[PDB]
Enzyme design. Sequence first.
Site, PDB file in Angstrom:
ATOM      1  N   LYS A   1      21.040  21.549  26.655  1.00  0.00           N
ATOM      2  CA  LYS A   1      20.176  20.804  25.755  1.00  0.00           C
ATOM      3  C   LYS A   1      21.050  19.968  24.814  1.00  0.00           C
ATOM      4  O   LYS A   1      20.994  20.125  23.591  1.00  0.00           O
ATOM      5  CB  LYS A   1      19.316  21.769  24.923  1.00  0.00           C
ATOM      6  CG  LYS A   1      18.545  22.812  25.715  1.00  0.00           C
ATOM      7  CD  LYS A   1      17.312  22.212  26.361  1.00  0.00           C
ATOM      8  CE  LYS A   1      16.713  23.174  27.384  1.00  0.00           C
ATOM      9  NZ  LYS A   1      16.424  24.512  26.800  1.00  0.00           N
TER      10      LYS A   1
ATOM     11  N   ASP B   1      11.733  17.213  32.023  1.00  0.00           N
ATOM     12  CA  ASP B   1      12.789  16.249  31.684  1.00  0.00           C
ATOM     13  C   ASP B   1      12.358  14.825  32.015  1.00  0.00           C
ATOM     14  O   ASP B   1      12.436  13.925  31.164  1.00  0.00           O
ATOM     15  CB  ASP B   1      14.089  16.582  32.400  1.00  0.00           C
ATOM     16  CG  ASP B   1      15.218  15.617  32.020  1.00  0.00           C
ATOM     17  OD1 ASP B   1      15.214  14.449  32.461  1.00  0.00           O
ATOM     18  OD2 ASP B   1      16.115  16.015  31.268  1.00  0.00           O
TER      19      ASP B   1
ATOM     20  N   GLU C   1      11.376  12.063  28.956  1.00  0.00           N
ATOM     21  CA  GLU C   1      12.089  10.816  28.608  1.00  0.00           C
ATOM     22  C   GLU C   1      11.203   9.573  28.651  1.00  0.00           C
ATOM     23  O   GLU C   1      11.465   8.547  27.992  1.00  0.00           O
ATOM     24  CB  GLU C   1      13.297  10.641  29.521  1.00  0.00           C
ATOM     25  CG  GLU C   1      12.991  10.485  30.967  1.00  0.00           C
ATOM     26  CD  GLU C   1      14.180  10.900  31.859  1.00  0.00           C
ATOM     27  OE1 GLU C   1      15.068  11.656  31.386  1.00  0.00           O
ATOM     28  OE2 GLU C   1      14.208  10.464  33.016  1.00  0.00           O
TER      29      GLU C   1
END
Lengths: 495, 490
Positions: A167, A230, A234
Amino acid sequence: LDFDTSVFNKEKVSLAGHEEYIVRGGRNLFPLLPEAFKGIKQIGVIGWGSQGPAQAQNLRDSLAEAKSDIVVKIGLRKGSKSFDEARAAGFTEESGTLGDIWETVSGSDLVLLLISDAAQADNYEKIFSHMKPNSILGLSHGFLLGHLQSAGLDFPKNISVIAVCPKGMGPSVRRLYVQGKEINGAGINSSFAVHQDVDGRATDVALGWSVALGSPFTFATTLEQEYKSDIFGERGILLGAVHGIVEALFRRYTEQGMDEEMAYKNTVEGITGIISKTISKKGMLEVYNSLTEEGKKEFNKAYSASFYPCMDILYECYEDVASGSEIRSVVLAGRRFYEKEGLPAFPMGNIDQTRMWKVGEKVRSTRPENDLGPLHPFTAGVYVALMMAQIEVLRKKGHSYSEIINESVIESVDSLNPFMHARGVAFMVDNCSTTARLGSRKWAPRFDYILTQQAFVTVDKDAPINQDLISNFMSDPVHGAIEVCAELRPTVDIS
Amino acid sequence: LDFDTSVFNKEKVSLAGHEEYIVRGGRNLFPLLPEAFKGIKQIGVIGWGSQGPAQAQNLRDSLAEAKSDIVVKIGLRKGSKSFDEARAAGFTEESGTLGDIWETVSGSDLVLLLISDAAQADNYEKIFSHMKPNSILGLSHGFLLGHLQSAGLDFPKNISVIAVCPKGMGPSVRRLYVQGKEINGAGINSSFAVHQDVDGRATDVALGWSVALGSPFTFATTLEQEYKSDIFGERGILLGAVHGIVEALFRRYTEQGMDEEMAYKNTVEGITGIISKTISKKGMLEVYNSLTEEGKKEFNKAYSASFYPCMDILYECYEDVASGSEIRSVVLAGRRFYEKEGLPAFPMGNIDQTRMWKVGEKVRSTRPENDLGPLHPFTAGVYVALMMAQIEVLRKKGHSYSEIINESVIESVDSLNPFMHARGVAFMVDNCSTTARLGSRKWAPRFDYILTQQAFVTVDKDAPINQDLISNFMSDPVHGAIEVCAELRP
Ligand SMILES: [Mg+2]
Ligand SMILES: [Mg+2]
Ligand SMILES: [Mg+2]
Ligand SMILES: [Mg+2]
Ligand SMILES: [Mg+2]
């Protein structure tokens, strides 16, 4: 979600009444690494770039500290411009610690595949063909699983497949590891997954890898959940959605008569500075509580108007990621960067030359030291609505609180936003990983349009506040969970 | 692309040195319909949106004129507006020309599936299970093929699958058909495809269907090409890209100090009015040649800066449509219109309440009868760049000149843009059918951002003109091809 480790000690955490297992890290655990890595004589780290150097250096240091004879060997493609850099860091042919990608994969018991998403999509068959039967493929992100799934394929049956997903950016993975030699709890947290386990070794190898990287905590997920979180994240609040909402807000404020520089400060600066700092320190409730009574009304107007429009796009994006549509589009996009089918090449262009980013350059160049910007209540209401909508989509799509919070709150305000406060959002859109850059370009415009067409129209109609939304925000279980999760953060700033 | 018809004569058209076959229709050919429809005793028209009413009545009339005993039977859910309308048009249970969907499918030798994209995706297994082996499924658009392919499926091996795709709105298919009874060559052109032919009858049946619809000319395509052209095209120049470029240009002009009403006129009014009309009458070169010497320079700056950005997004969109990505996303989006999984419902929203559309409402409320608006050379350069970029993507991706021209140039300036000039772009987006509406919302913002972030930045750099792009435009073989195709218009 459970896992079975023979080597490490599983600890429980409770978030909003939901229990999860974690593995606490620390240098005192390094003596356990030889046991975790049974059957491993060589770890091949494939690729340089961002994560390769950090992971290889951390693993090397940890294994030395553990008095392990395991060899960390970097494998590079023939076209790589990173041979001299690898050698400068002590990875050399002479010492058996650097080689050609294929030779390196062949000799490895654990292959850490750290090349680009596009390179993974192009090379997986050859990677699989070179691996030892019963060896272990480790990924630091689940793109490849998503790619195979989109094509109705899976990994070979004769290898284990695991993931350790830090992370934090590569440079921080290394920096915090070195600091961790002095400061207990300094390191970058990770999540881990075991997708296939052919011989029973996979879980301990994954946990060993995470611990050896210096992860102060290792959280448990699945490879499918990690890639969905993920790739969607984004396109959501991490990058795409923040770009889109700031374009929409800057346009609105300037339309209303605000000076351009002030419009920039009240949108971009506020989100990536003061708002992020406040959320990082005391959470989203404190953003609202820190406002004037007048400001609270403005925050509530924005939140009430913006929550569902943001959710509409996030929900769409999530389902496209989960379904195969979005990963397929990313893979095809990468192929269009080059000439094919008699058509031109279309590499990505820059965003940084439109109205607001030109203004941002000026703002930052005259910006006082440690300026965190103004807290504009309307901007805050939109940003917090976006955050809460993304949390809700991930919750209803079955993600764990630790993954929701770690990747969609903490990593945003502690890793990415501070980076963006320093260099501007445009910098990130122009310089991030290809998959993230494509995602931001594709989805930022969606957020801008939906806020402009729906949220702003609602506000301008003088619509009543949706008290269901507002009460839900103030009472949401995630706020308590964020407090608990925020305590599991590294003991030094991560970006 | 060749095809083999035992009933109809074909003729050639040469477009940019590429020969294609077409089939000329006309009511004078109606005596050929009995042989075209060998083995057909009942044609089942399934559905009654915009196309059902026209296709049912046109086929009924053509078969009557042919003295054929083939029955045209409408399949609809009893108890609906559509059912009322079919009965009012003389299709009734009493006469055996109106019935339940499934009974109608089961009794039909040719099944014309005219229900919505969503309805086809939801019902295909049941349709297939009710069809007679060796019967023929006719589609007027290839969405269902795209849907099946996205799931790695295809049609059953025991039915023929054909398509006849009119190049006009349902009402015009009927109105012009009726007009065609008096005025020679009045009617809406079509393309046809044969996806599966299990017994050798499929081509004659497809052509009979097209001729019986009153198609003055029928062009040849494939079902895959038709659905890609349509679904990509609406995200491109037919709808989504027009919305995107006009938002981008309106924003630019107003930033540059142009008053809002003039900015609206110079973007939306010009595109859907005078620019469209000029292209329709004399093609894209006439748009450029009509400009002042100063205007020509502005057109060229805009074209040079905009062509590749437009191409970039068009190319992306095309590949997402062809790969399965986009059709799957459309199917999923439909399911989010309602609550599921503990999440809210998200019905499609409206575009018409933002700055430029409010300005547009005010402008339109006062715009006179038949005002075509100003022809702004910068707007013209962007719009023509977009049109040429779409042409190029389609051409490289393998589509025929007639499909490129008919669907991406002609149907746009002659059918769609006049409709948008009358009703407004916002109206068209907000009331369009679902797949196109979703397409417009998803892709319009992409065109807006690529122009704003790239094309306009290039112009504002004082970038030198890309002379190769401009030369390529002026000499493009598509301009002569459009002239030739344009002559086959109704
Ligand atoms: Mg699994
Ligand atoms: Mg991540
Ligand atoms: Mg990513
Ligand atoms: Mg069409
Ligand atoms: Mg369509």
